[PDB]
Each structure stands twice: as C-alpha cells, then as structure tokens.
From a paper:
It is predominantly plasmid mediated, disseminated worldwide, and encountered in diverse Gram-negative pathogens, mostly Enterobacterales, but occasionally also in nonfermenters.
One possible explanation for this is the presence in KPC-2 of a Cys69-Cys238 disulfide bond, a distinguishing feature of carbapenem-hydrolyzing class A enzymes. To test whether a disulfide could prevent cross-link formation, we constructed a CTX-M-15 Gly238Cys mutation (CTX-M-15G238C) which already contains a Cys residue at position 69 and used mass spectrometry to investigate whether this mutant could support cross-link formation. As a further investigation of the importance of active-site movement to cross-link formation, we sought to constrain the CTX-M-15 active site through introduction of the equivalent disulfide by directed mutagenesis. This, however, did not affect the ability of mutant enzymes CTX-M-15G238C and CTX-M-15G238C/G239_Y240insA to form cross-links, indicating that differences in disulfide content (and possibly a concurrent reduction in active site flexibility) are not the explanation for the differing abilities of CTX-M-15 and KPC-2 to support cross-link formation.
Residue numbers in the entry: 27 to 288
Write the structure that this text describes.
C-alpha cells in the first residue's frame, strides 16, 4: 500500500539516514520494497553467505564440517567473542559457522572466507545461486568501513531477501545443509533488539544482524508468524556521520510497519 510506503518514508526521514527494506511474503508471493535496489554495506550480515558457501561445499565433502582449524593470536581481529577462548587450539568448521552466525565472531567469518577461497569465492557462490548483486570484497575487519558511495562489501535489500529465501526456504542447499543453516540462524543470540523487536513475541525468527561504520545497522531474517506462511525480511540502514551510533530501533520500526496486519 501507499500507506506502508508513506510510513517507511516517514520513518526514514525521522531517522536522519537512508533505509532499505525488502519483505517477501510467501503466503501470496508478494513483496514490499523501499530503496530495495540501492546498495548498503552488509557488515556482519555477510556471514550468512559465507556460512552457506561452506555448507554448499560440504555437500560433496562429508568430513568438511568436522575439519579442525587452528586459532592463533595472529587470527584475532576486532571482535572475537568465541575464538578468543580457543587460541592455540582448534575449532571445527561447524563450530566456526555457529560462532559467526550466533555470536557474530569475526575470526570465525575469516576462517569461513579462507576455507572457500576468499572473498571472490564467496561472491562467486552468490553468483552461482543467481544473485548478481552481492559483493564481498574484503575480509574482517576492513569490510566494515561502510563509506557512503563505496560499493565494496555491499548488496541490495531485494537481492539479499531473494537470496535468503533461496537459502532458508528454497533449494540452494541440500536438505541437511538447509536445516543446519536454519537451526544456526534460529539460535542467533544477537538479534532481539532488531527485527525481532518489531514483531509479536510469539513469532519465530532466524536472523543475522550487523552494525558497522557510518552507523550502519542491519538485519536479515526468516520469520515464521503464528499459523502463517513464512516471511523473508531485510532491513538495512546507514547514516551520514562517520561516528553515528547504531539504530536497531529503526529496524524494529520498519519490521513493525511492514508486518502490521499480518
Ligand atoms: Cl561523526
């Protein structure tokens, strides 16, 4: 409705920044879009694509998720909540995937990236799925600069919503791998203040958040409303000032606007 568009424009104006939304409602195959073809820095929301690339590789390598990866001091980056506890030992690729997706651990992201061949390999995986918009250019932590106008490490709301639908509800991954990705995302510990905060308490959510430079504040989610077909929702948000603070409330407000009614 124009009403939903007006409400999103009002929210964006009040927020002071630039808001991007894509909702896919699988009940009727409809979409609600706002700036959905513009690019936004992904921040840690790119961890979903990297974990999915590892899952895809595991379809033909059954030992892959159990493979051990050494964690060294030289692996530490800016935010390492799980990896810092494993320095001088190993973690499996499954454990790194869970740490990336559920605690936003940046060492874990770098190990997923390295395993599949680097940022260009993660990007080539997106391309193989039919996502011609996603680009992972850099590793952690430099992928977080989020400079306005810089296309590095960006995607669009439309593209990420369509790809997340393929990954979590469609057939991008084998049944075992899809279920594993969904379980990991449903177990996220970092999302309660973002999309989830704009939805009724009873709804079930798997999501991945990310915040980075220029007050960029993001969330991408698969949502099971009570007794309804699932939704896919991407809410991206960025601000003019380099040191702007995160605005998870803006993502909650956008989620409420686009799901009201339903
Ligand atoms: Cl500033």
């Amino acid at each position: 409705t124009a009403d939903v568009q007006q409400k999103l424009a009002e929210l964006e104006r009040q927020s002071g920044g630039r808001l991007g939304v894509a909702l896919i409602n699988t009940a009727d195959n409809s979409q609600i879009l706002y700036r959905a073809d513009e690019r936004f820095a992904m921040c840690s929301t790119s961890k979903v694509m990297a974990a999915a690339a590892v899952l895809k590789k595991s379809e033909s390598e059954p030992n892959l998720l159990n493979q051990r990866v050494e964690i060294k001091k030289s692996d530490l980056v800016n935010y390492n909540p799980i990896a810092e506890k494993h320095v001088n030992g190993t973690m499996s690729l499954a454990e790194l995937s869970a740490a990336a997706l559920q605690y936003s651990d940046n060492v874990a992201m770098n190990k997923l990236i390295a395993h599949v061949g680097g940022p260009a390999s993660v990007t080539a995986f997106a391309r193989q799925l039919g996502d011609e918009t996603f680009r992972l250019d850099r590793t952690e932590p430099t992928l977080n600069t989020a400079i306005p106008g810089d296309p590095r490490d960006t995607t669009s709301p439309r593209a990420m919503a369509q790809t997340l639908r393929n990954l979590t509800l469609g057939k991008a991954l084998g049944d075992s791998q899809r279920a594993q990705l969904v379980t990991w995302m449903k177990g996220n510990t970092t999302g309660a203040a973002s999309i989830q905060a704009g939805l009724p308490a009873s709804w079930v959510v798997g999501d991945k958040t990310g915040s980075c430079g220029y007050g960029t504040t993001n969330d991408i989610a698969v949502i099971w409303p009570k007794d309804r077909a699932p939704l896919i929702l991407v809410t991206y948000f960025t601000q003019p000032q380099p040191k702007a603070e995160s605005r998870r409330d803006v993502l909650a407000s956008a989620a409420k606007i686009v799901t009201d009614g339903l």
